[PDB]
Amino acid sequence: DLEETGRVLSIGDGIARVHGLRNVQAEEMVEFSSGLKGMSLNLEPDNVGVVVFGNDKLIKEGDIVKRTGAIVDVPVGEELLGRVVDALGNAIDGKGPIGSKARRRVGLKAPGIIPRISVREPMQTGIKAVDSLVPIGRGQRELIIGDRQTGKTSIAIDTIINQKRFNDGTDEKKKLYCIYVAIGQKRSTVAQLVKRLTDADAMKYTIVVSATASDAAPLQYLAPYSGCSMGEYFRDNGKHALIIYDDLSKQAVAYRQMSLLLRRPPGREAYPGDVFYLHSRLLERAAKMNDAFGGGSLTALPVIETQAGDVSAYIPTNVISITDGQIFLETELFYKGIRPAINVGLSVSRVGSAAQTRAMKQVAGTMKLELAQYREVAAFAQFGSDLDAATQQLLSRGVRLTELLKQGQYSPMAIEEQVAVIYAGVRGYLDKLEPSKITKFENAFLSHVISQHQALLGKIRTDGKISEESDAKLKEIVTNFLAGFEA
Amino acid sequence: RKLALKTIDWVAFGEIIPRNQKAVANSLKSWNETLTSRLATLPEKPPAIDWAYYKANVAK
C-alpha cells in the first residue's frame, strides 16, 4: 500500500509537515518510514503537523508517512508491576517483553461524579511527619513540592518502600500499585533509583515508567498519560494505584517546546495555557472511585521540584488550584540537617482526616497544635527567643516534637510504630529528655516496642486507633520504658 | 554456641572497684551495648544455592 501514506512534506527538527494521509484521524499515532510513531497532532488542511516521536536525524524529506491509523494506546497490565519500561512499554531495564500486552488508550477520560467516590481511606508513607502531619488518603492528586535530590526522591522512596508491607498486606487498600512516572529523570537518576526500588523490591507492585533526560520530549510528555490510562485501569479494577509524576514541571517544558516547534504557543512563562488543562484532564483521571470501579483508586502524587520555591509560577499556581494542597518541603531545615526538611505551614492537606488512622489522629492532633504554638513564639516577635514562661515549657514540648517528626535518611515505618513514638512525645515522657536524644530514644524505644509491644501494637494495629489496652499499656510503657531508656 | 543466659543488673554492674576494672566496667558496659545491638540484629541464617539451577546454567 501506499495511498494513505504520505510523503514528508517538510522535516527538520522533528517537526514534520506531512504530506498526505489526508483522511487522518485526529491525534492519530502515525507510522513511519523510519518505523517510528508520530502524532498527527495538527491537522492543518495542507499538512499534517506531525510531532515526531523520537529521533529525526534518521529522517529525511518526502519520506513516507504511513498511517498507524491508531490513536495511541499503551500496553496495560499489572505486568508493569515489576517492570521498567519506557512509556510505550519498552523495557529499558532489559527485562524483556512485559506481560502487559493488553493495550489501552492513554487518554481514557476522567470519572463521573457518581462514579467517583470521596476518600475516606487513609494510606500512609512510613514517615511520621508525613502520616501525622499530612495523613495520606487514597485516590489523590495533591502536590508534592520540594527540590531535587536531597533524596527528594527519598521521600517518595520511603513511601514506596512503605507500601511494600502493604503490598505484603492485602486489599488495594493496603496493597498498592506504585507507579512511578519518572519524567526526565536521567538514566543515571533512574539507574540509581530503580536500583533502589529493586533493592527494596517494593518494585514488585510497581511500575517504573522511566523517561530519562535523554528521551524525546513528547515521549516524556506522554509518559504520564501512558501511566494515566494504566492507573485508571487499576483504579477501575479496584486497584489503587499510586502515581508519582515526577515531574510535570519538566513535562511542561517539553510540552511547550513541542508546541513551539509546532509554533503552537508559548503562553505565560512561555508555556501555552492548556498545559493546565493537560494536567487537569490527566489528573482528574486520578480519583478514588466507587465500587462499581472496584472502588479503586489512582492516587496521584504529582511532584513539582521547584526552582527557588517559585510557585506563583504558572504551572505551580495552576497545579495549586487543582491540588488540594501542596506539601512543601523546607530547605533551611535540610541544611540544619533537618531532613525531612518541611515547612508544613506550606504543606497542607485540606483533606486532613479522611487520610488517617485514629491512632495517629489522637496523638497528632494536639501535636500539630503544639508545634504551631511553638512556632508562633518564635514568630510574633520574629525571634526564637521567648515571650512567656509557660511557653518556655511549651517550646520544649514543640522542640521535642521537632526531633520526632524527622525521618531517617532512607527509612519508612508503619502507623502503629509511628504512633508509638508519637504518643511518647505527645503525652510527654521525653521533655524530660534533651531534644537530640529523642530520636535516639526512638532507636531503642522502637526496638523495644517492636520486641515487646508488638503485642500491644498488635492491638493498636488492630484498632487503627490507640485503644484502652494500648494506651493503658502505653502510659505505662512509655513511662517505664522511657524510664528504662534513660535509666 | 547458642546464647548465654546471664542477666545483668546494670545498677550493680558499673560500681565495682577491683580498682583496675571499675573504669573498665563503665567502658565494658558500653562495649557490651555495641556487641549487644550487633548480635541482636544479625540475620540468623544466610541463604544457600539452588545448585541444580546453576548446575545447568554455569557452563564452565
Binding site: 527538520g12 536521567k186 533526560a213 526552582q307 540544619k336 | -
Partner: protein, 466 residues
C-alpha cells in the same frame, strides 16, 4: 551530493542540494571552499534545501556555490594520538604538531549508552579539597558541573583540580575547551608542556586537548562538545579508561546552540534559549557517564549566566549533576578560596551512609551551623549583635572560623595567591571542622583558619598570633 549556497546568512548556511537531501546531520564539505568548511545539515527544509550550519567563516560563498556532501554526518579521527594534542573540534591539530592522525574516525553525534551497562551507582572521588570532599562528595566518573561565575578563580580552580588530580590519575584526561580562551588554552598549553604530562614524547599524553574556542563560530563551539565526547567515549569504553573529561565550558556550547536558535528560524526559548535546550542536555549529557566500560569523570565548566542559576539553563543542569558544583561568588568576593557555595554544591552521595555518615555528620553539624548562621544574616545585617543570643554568638565566631577554615590558598597559583596553597587529606578535614564543633578554638584568632589546608596548620596560624 552537491548543494548550492542558496542563502548565507552568516554561518547559517542555507543550502539547497538538489542532489537529494542526505541526513539531517549529514555533514557537508563546501566546494569552492578549499578551506574545509563543514556544514552540518540541520533541517530538511523542504525544497531540497536544508538549513545547515557552517561552523566556520563564510568568505566567498557565492550564492549557488557548490557544496559537496561529506556523505555522513561529521566524522573525526579518534585514536590515542590525540592525547597531548590540541585538537580542535575538527579532529585536526591545534597542537600544531602536524595532523592528529588516527586509525579510526567516528561520527561524533551518537547514542547515549543504554541503561544496563551503565553502572547504576558510583563512588565518591576525592579532590584533595576539604570543602569539596566533605561537603559535596563528588563521584568518580560522575558529571560534576562547575557552576561558577566569569573567571571567578574557577578557571584557576579547575587548573588546580587538574593539578590535584590528573597527575594522580590512572586513566587519562581530556580537556575539551568549549569556548575556551585561546589564551587559557595557551596557558594551559604551557602548563601542560610544563607539566610534561603533556609530554610530547607522547601524543599519548596523560591529557588530550580538544579545543573549540570562542573565536570559532558557534557551530564549531556547539560541536566541539560532541567531538570531544566521541573521542572520550572511545577512550573510556574503547580504551577502557577512566577518562577525566574536562570540559570548560559547556555553557559556551549551550550558548552556541542558543545563538543559532534564532536563525535556526526557531523561537529561541526563554531569554532567547532553545526549546530543545533540554534535549540538548540529554543528548550530550546522557552520552557521558560511567559505564561498566569505564568512567568518564565529567567535569563541566558551567558558566552560570549572570550567576543566574534560577536561569533555566543552570536550572536544568542540576538535574544532570552527580555533583553540582556551585562556586559562590559571594564568598569568592570575600576573597575566599575555597570560594564555593557549598550549601548549593551537592553530591547526591552527600547522604550519610554512603560516605561514612560520621564524615557526613560532622558536616551536618557544620552545615547546619553555618546555615543557621546564614539565617541570621538579615537580622545581623542591621542589628549586628547585642540583643541576640549567646550560643549564636559562639556559632557566629565558630562559623567565622569555619568559614575561614574552608579557605585554602592555591598551591599552583602561588602566582595568584602569593601563598603557597595547601592540600588536606580527610582526617584533618573531618576532624578539622569537628574540632571547631568542639570549639577548641574560641579564644584562638578566628580569621586564622583562613587560607589553610590542615586545621593543625590553621591552629598554628591562630597561634603565632596567639
Amino acid at each position: 551530493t552537491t548543494g548550492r549556497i542558496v542563502a548565507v546568512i552568516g554561518a547559517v548556511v542555507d543550502v539547497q542540494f538538489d542532489e537529494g537531501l542526505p541526513p539531517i546531520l549529514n555533514a557537508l564539505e563546501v566546494q569552492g571552499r578549499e578551506t574545509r568548511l563543514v556544514l552540518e545539515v540541520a533541517q530538511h527544509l523542504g525544497e531540497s534545501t536544508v538549513r545547515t550550519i557552517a561552523m566556520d567563516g563564510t568568505e566567498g560563498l557565492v550564492r549557488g556555490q557548490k557544496v559537496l556532501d561529506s556523505g555522513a554526518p561529521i566524522r573525526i579521527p579518534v585514536g590515542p594520538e590525540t592525547l597531548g594534542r590540541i585538537m580542535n573540534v575538527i579532529g585536526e591539530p591545534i597542537d600544531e604538531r602536524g595532523p592528529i592522525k588516527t586509525k579510526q574516525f567516528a561520527a561524533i553525534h551518537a547514542e547515549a549508552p543504554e541503561f544496563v551497562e551503565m553502572s547504576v551507582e558510583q563512588e565518591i572521588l576525592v579532590t584533595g579539597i576539604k570543602v569539596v570532599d566533605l561537603l559535596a562528595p563528588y563521584a568518580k566518573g560522575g558529571k560534576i558541573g562547575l557552576f561558577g561565575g566569569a573567571g571567578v578563580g574557577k578557571t584557576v580552580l579547575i587548573m588546580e583540580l587538574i593539578n590535584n588530580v590528573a597527575k594522580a590519575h590512572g586513566g587519562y584526561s581530556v580537556f575539551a575547551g568549549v569556548g575556551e580562551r585561546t589564551r587559557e588554552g595557551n596557558d594551559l598549553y604551557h602548563e601542560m608542556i610544563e607539566s610534561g604530562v603533556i609530554n610530547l614524547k607522547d601524543a599519548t599524553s596523560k591529557v588530550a586537548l580538544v579545543y573549540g574556542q570562542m573565536n570559532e563560530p558557534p557551530g564549531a563551539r556547539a560541536r566541539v562538545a560532541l567531538t570531544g565526547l566521541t573521542v572520550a567515549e572511545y577512550f573510556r569504553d574503547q580504551e577502557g579508561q577512566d577518562v577525566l573529561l574536562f570540559i570548560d565550558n559547556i555553557f559556551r556550547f549551550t550558548q552556541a546552540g542558543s545563538e543559532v536558535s534564532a536563525l535556526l528560524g526557531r523561537i529561541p526559548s526563554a531569554v532567547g534559549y532553545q526549546p530543545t535546550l533540554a534535549t540538548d542536555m540529554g543528548t550530550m549529557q546522557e552520552r557521558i557517564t560511567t559505564t561498566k566500560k569505564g568512567s568518564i569523570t565529567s567535569v563541566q565548566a558551567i558558566y552560570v549566566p549572570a550567576d543566574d542559576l534560577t536561569d533555566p539553563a543552570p536550572a536544568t543542569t542540576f538535574a544532570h549533576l552527580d555533583a553540582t558544583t556551585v562556586l559562590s561568588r559571594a564568598i569568592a568576593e570575600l576573597g575566599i578560596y575555597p570560594a564555593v557555595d557549598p550549601l548549593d554544591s551537592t553530591s547526591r552521595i552527600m547522604d550519610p551512609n554512603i560516605v561514612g555518615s560520621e564524615h557526613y555528620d560532622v558536616a551536618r553539624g557544620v552545615q547546619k551551623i553555618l546555615q543557621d548562621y546564614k539565617s541570621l544574616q538579615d537580622i545581623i545585617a542591621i542589628l549586628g549583635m547585642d540583643e541576640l543570643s549567646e550560643e549564636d554568638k559562639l556559632t557566629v565566631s565558630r562559623a567565622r572560623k569555619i568559614q575561614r577554615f574552608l579557605s585554602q590558598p592555591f598551591q599552583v597559583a602561588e602566582v595568584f595567591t602569593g601563598h603557597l596553597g595547601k592540600l588536606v587529606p580527610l582526617k584533618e578535614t573531618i576532624k578539622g571542622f569537628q574540632q571547631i564543633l568542639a570549639g577548641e578554638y574560641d579564644h584562638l584568632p578566628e580569621q586564622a583558619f583562613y587560607m589553610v589546608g590542615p586545621i593543625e596548620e590553621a591552629v598554628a596560624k591562630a597561634d603565632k598570633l596567639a
